[PDB]
Design a protein around this ligand. Sequence first.
Ligand SMILES: *[C@@H]1O[C@H](CO)[C@@H](O[C@@H]2O[C@H](CO)[C@@H](O)[C@H](O)[C@H]2NC(C)=O)[C@H](O)[C@H]1NC(C)=O
Ligand SMILES: *[C@@H]1O[C@H](CO)[C@@H](O)[C@H](O)[C@H]1NC(C)=O
Ligand SMILES: *[C@@H]1O[C@H](CO)[C@@H](O)[C@H](O)[C@H]1NC(C)=O
Ligand SMILES: *[C@@H]1O[C@H](CO)[C@@H](O)[C@H](O)[C@H]1NC(C)=O
Ligand SMILES: *[C@@H]1O[C@H](CO)[C@@H](O)[C@H](O)[C@H]1NC(C)=O
Ligand SMILES: *[C@@H]1O[C@H](CO)[C@@H](O)[C@H](O)[C@H]1NC(C)=O
Ligand SMILES: [Zn+2]
Lengths: 195, 596
Amino acid sequence: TNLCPFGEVFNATRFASVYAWNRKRISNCVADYSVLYNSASFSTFKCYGVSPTKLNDLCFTNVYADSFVIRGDEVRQIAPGQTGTIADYNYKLPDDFTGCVIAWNSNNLDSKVGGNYNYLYRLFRKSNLKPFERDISTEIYQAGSTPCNGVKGFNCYFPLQSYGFQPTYGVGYQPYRVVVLSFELLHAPATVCGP
Amino acid sequence: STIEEQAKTFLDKFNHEAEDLFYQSSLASWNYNTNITEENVQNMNNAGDKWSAFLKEQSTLAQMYPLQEIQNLTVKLQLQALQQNGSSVLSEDKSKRLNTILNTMSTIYSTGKVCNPDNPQECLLLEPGLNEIMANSLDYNERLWAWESWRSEVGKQLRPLYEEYVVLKNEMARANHYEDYGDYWRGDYEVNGVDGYDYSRGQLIEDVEHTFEEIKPLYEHLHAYVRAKLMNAYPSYISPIGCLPAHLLGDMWGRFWTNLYSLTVPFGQKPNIDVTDAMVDQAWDAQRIFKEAEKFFVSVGLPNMTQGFWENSMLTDPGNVQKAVCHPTAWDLGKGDFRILMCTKVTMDDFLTAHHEMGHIQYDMAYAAQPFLLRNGANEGFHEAVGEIMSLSAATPKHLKSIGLLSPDFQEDNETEINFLLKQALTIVGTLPFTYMLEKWRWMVFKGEIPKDQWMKKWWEMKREIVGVVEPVPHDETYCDPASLFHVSNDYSFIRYYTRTLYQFQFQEALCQAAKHEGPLHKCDISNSTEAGQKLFNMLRLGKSEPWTLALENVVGAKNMNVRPLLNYFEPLFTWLKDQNKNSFVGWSTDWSPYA
Ligand SMILES: *[C@@H]1O[C@H](CO)[C@@H](O[C@@H]2O[C@H](CO)[C@@H](O)[C@H](O)[C@H]2NC(C)=O)[C@H](O)[C@H]1NC(C)=O
Ligand SMILES: *[C@@H]1O[C@H](CO)[C@@H](O)[C@H](O)[C@H]1NC(C)=O
Ligand SMILES: *[C@@H]1O[C@H](CO)[C@@H](O)[C@H](O)[C@H]1NC(C)=O
Ligand SMILES: *[C@@H]1O[C@H](CO)[C@@H](O)[C@H](O)[C@H]1NC(C)=O
Ligand SMILES: *[C@@H]1O[C@H](CO)[C@@H](O)[C@H](O)[C@H]1NC(C)=O
Ligand SMILES: *[C@@H]1O[C@H](CO)[C@@H](O)[C@H](O)[C@H]1NC(C)=O
Ligand SMILES: [Zn+2]
């Protein structure tokens, strides 16, 4: 009766930046998914392919928990077939995504009067992200044709921008902690059932 | 990558960086305005200096993308606005001279003192000292003393500064490829590259004068009626065919004739509608006032106030120790943060002011989705026009009876309607010749059509001819009477108050049409009309993204400023005024003066 360490992911002291989103592989344990869906503590709980209603009666080989922080208006970008600074440059979900997206307001934790500049996001990139890809590079973005020489300048911008979460922000600009659960199914032992 | 693509990326970085720095400056400014401490002034200046320095650097960077290679008009709108006038097109030395001149003129105006003869210690500022005299006093000599002393001791200081101010402002404007500084000011209404909606800078002069001609018959009868009533009050001071003396108009300059209501009320036995007592009887507080205002905008389909609005706004005077600036303001800090600063009292006036300021908020929330540089009114006159029409509907007896403040037994007769419309005309109609004449003088001074040795000669020639107002004391060219007004000495364009006045009644007539209002336009209430709210919202969400001609067409169906709704609003008074002036002379002679 090994319980899946979901508390490590949802109740972490600090979340990752969306450009450097964390991934926690969950294996060889019993997961009570109904506790999360029937807790009434999340503003967003949407599942794709799988059903949140009592589908802890199923077994999966590996479960991945992806966690990061974005603003409220960008939560809608964590979904299949979406476009925006987060979806194309920070965290991309596949069109055939099978899993759940969980989010909740974290203005009481990730906001600070004067600005909390701990959480960043990628503003510029040469191309869009392939699904479940992570880019933590700090290369200076070349917007023009003159080489940037590794420092900011005219047509040469630092690719990462800060949210600067303040508690007096509107809901659309307040920080939100997002947990994405991926349910993988290989021709494999299927070690994560979780009655 | 093309030039346009590099401009898009450059604007992408500017927007994010500008929003963060703008929020920091606005938050620091908010903390001072609600909590006046020596510290807060420094934090406000520090945050503001970073914001100004950021704008200066970004404006220079924006200049390296020439507008001739951009086809996307929305991109070009943001780029040109960023390119602004540039980062001080002038030399550094001339930019420093102009800055000091502007600060000195502002300091002279805000600190100018006038002392009563025989007591050099009992001196009065303009606010509240001299303003109180001009707004309440009925004594001819006391009003004349305040009028002359303000211009002879403060205006004379501003005359040399304003002369050099004109030269430097023109040099900046002409180097910005404008004809003059007045032409630079008229650029706020300029529209290019949009077929069927273009508008030239010179067209503004044409349209203002053309619409003012239709205002003249209404103002002439208003002028004649006011002169007749004042002639009964000061019989040895007013000629029946001459201009009104400048110091007997209700304030320091005659900008508004509002304070002439007591001496010019048509029916002085029927009192005004004052629901202040009813509000106190029902134990209303500031939150109730803003809750009712929020109720009003929801009834027409507009969204309710955000949750941060109620937590972060200051709807009451803070207290006895913590000081705050009590001027009613609506704050758009960005990042979804909308607040109202107001030291609200339980009065009818503050009840209407809350509707006015919340109208600004609704405008700010509507175009919040627009890019940062396009988050503003369609032109300089749109924002206050939106705010004014909210107080129009909220102040009607129809609206006040529906919210329980006006008793249903109370019924309005046509005498009270004339009293209300006359009070409206003293403020709204009375300022139109004053506003147009003042800006025309500045336009001609910037254009170079008025020589320096004829500034005051031309200033009072136009006052007599256009406004029907005559100076009580002759003034030579050592005076700078236009600079005695705040806007002239503090470098603010003034034509916005003329265009906004015509905009608001165009807005109200269109919205009341969509609300299916029956009867005179001044009795209309757009409450409970989602059709009116949707029509207004179609323009509010636009912001600066579209030409103001197109934004105006969204509400009223016309592409240009029109004066007919203004005359439609005041038609019951205009008919009454013409009947009153049958025994009086209509018009004025410009050669009569009180000093003979
Ligand atoms: C001007 O540029 C803007 C943005 O650079 C264009 O708007 C984009 O349109 C695409 C679809 O073609 C959308 O996917 C983007 O989300 C839009 N972005 C924004 C910021 O609106 C706009 O279409 C361009 N206008 C013209 C006339 O070309
Ligand atoms: C986080 O902590 C709360 C309170 O201790 C608990 O109810 C919740 O289950 C925890 N989260 C997870 C994923 O276990
Ligand atoms: C006012 O500002 C001071 C600092 O200048 C601060 O210590 C104090 O808490 C503030 N008071 C309020 C009511 O915000
Ligand atoms: C505003 O209205 C929405 C319904 O559209 C409601 O959910 C919200 O709680 C309201 N907020 C306030 C402050 O009234
Ligand atoms: C709007 O409609 C509501 C519900 O019918 C009513 O209570 C209210 O008095 C109306 N307001 C006006 C201004 O007619
Ligand atoms: C108000 O109406 C009455 C009734 O027709 C009329 O005699 C009176 O002159 C009117 N008052 C005006 C128009 O000021
Ligand atoms: Zn206003």
